[PDB]
Amino acid sequence: PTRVTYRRRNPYNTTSNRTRVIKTPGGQLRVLHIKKRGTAPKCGDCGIKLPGIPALRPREYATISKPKKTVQRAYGGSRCGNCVRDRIIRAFLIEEQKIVKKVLKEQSQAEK
Amino acid sequence: MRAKWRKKRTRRLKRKRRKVRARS
Amino acid sequence: RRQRVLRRLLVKYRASGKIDKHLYHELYHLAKGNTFKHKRALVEHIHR
Amino acid sequence: GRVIRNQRKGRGSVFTAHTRLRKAPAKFRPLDYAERHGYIRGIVKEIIHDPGRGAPLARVVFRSPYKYKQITETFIANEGMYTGQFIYAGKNAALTVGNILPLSSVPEGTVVSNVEEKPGDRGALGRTSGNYVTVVGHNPDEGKTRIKLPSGAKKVVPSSSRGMIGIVAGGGRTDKPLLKASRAKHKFAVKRNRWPKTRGVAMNPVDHPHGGGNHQHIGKASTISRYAAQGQKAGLIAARRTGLLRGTQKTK
Amino acid sequence: PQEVSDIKKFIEICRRKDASSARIKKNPKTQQIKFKVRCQRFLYTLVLKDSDKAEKLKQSLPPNLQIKDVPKRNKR
């Protein structure tokens, strides 16, 4: 039932002084200071968390290899994939509608 | 990747190239 | 506690095959209302 | 005596405006060549609420006719606008809710909002929740348009002024009672330091012109002249009449 | 600390420029034998359950680096 104390000079509970209780091989109860929890990146359009990418603080992403930070397809990061399919379909149909519109206007109205 | 990361890599290649020219 | 006990029993009966889904769904809403006092009262109603 | 309360508010020390939570002001785009001769369109990204105001704001994204980038804007949202809507601005824009087109290309009888007093000042008139202005008639020669303001007054503005079709969202905000002292405090705590407010009759003669006495009373006529020295204007200023409004009001 | 799964690559580790030393610890109670080597960055550990293969391993590794026995109650 031993009580514990901080190990740094900050005595306040201020969302940056995060602790957890551990038991040591010497049979004592100590306090171990820990960092904050990373957040998973979200999607560009819909706003849901992308699968296959870990959640870390913004600085740790500089030490990890490229294949662990992306997904092998167009717009690998920042886009969920459901939205990527929508972009492919939407882009194709719009241009097709442009072809018929210009032929209809150029032919049926400039025949004279 | 940040600029300092890219500058270091291209600076390395320049050093390697000059040594080869000096040797040959 | 009582709601968990009744709901757990109904899942067991449906999977084994003692009752089908049509009787299961009706009993589920009957249990949500204050109909069955305890586990014994529910199984007795199933037999009838 | 000392300096009375309403004289101190001009020094701007404690009675300033809280602006930490406000992101940007609400304006139109600057008048440009594309919007003077044709039209351009933009997407509505978000409908957001900013503190200290009704009339929820809308964020719109336009392109750049001269450079490879896009610019985001901030308008006041008319009732009926929705996320993802295409809205158009220019001289030849269609006449639908949410569009922005010069006041000349508008038939009489339509309601608009955020009207420019002069072409290019980005919105001055009719920009409060549930308010609008109405066009009355045109003068095609020496182009000038008659409009009717929410207070009832009539005004003449140049024919090139702009306005956005519809009615400012927010509806009937001021119908339900505040009903609680706390609710009034929350409303004003994000605007200014003006709550609560003390009656001048309960003060002392050194503090306010209404002053003290053995009974709480004013002691002299409460209507103050139009040209009086600062520190004297405490009451009904330049009142034309007074009392309960029985008949109809001739002024329009 | 890092496991070495098999015998083949453990001797490969010991044949390195920065392999400073090595030691042997044996646990009689659980009938287990552990081989440890100290490199520049990590301390690789190899675990053997049998005792016969231990003798062959001791002599196969290069003679340059030292080998110790890790007695009980190491002095402070």
Partner: protein, 91 residues
């Protein structure tokens, strides 16, 4: 098992603020906490977020409406007027 005769939702106010004032606020509270059918997806899930903002919980669309109602009679009357005026005059 009705728990109230006439007070209704405004029973949280107890015996304060006077009978008449509670009636006016009840008129406006009832219509803002309800749910409305979405005009785009058709599901019955649209709820008020801010003083003049309503959003669908299913298709994620966001629309600006009245203070305590999705639309106001004045705004509704204007769409018909604007539609009728536009299509006869220019077409």
């Amino acid at each position: 098992s009705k728990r109230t005769k006439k007070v209704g939702i405004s029973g949280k106010y107890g015996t304060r603020y006077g009978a008449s004032l509670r009636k006016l606020v009840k008129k406006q509270e009832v219509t803002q906490h309800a749910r409305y059918t979405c005009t785009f997806c058709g599901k019955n899930s649209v709820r008020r977020t801010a003083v003049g903002i309503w959003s669908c919980k299913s298709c994620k669309k966001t629309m600006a409406g009245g203070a305590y109602t999705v639309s106001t009679p004045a705004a509704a009357a204007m769409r018909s007027t604007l539609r009728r005026l536009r299509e006869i005059t220019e077409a």
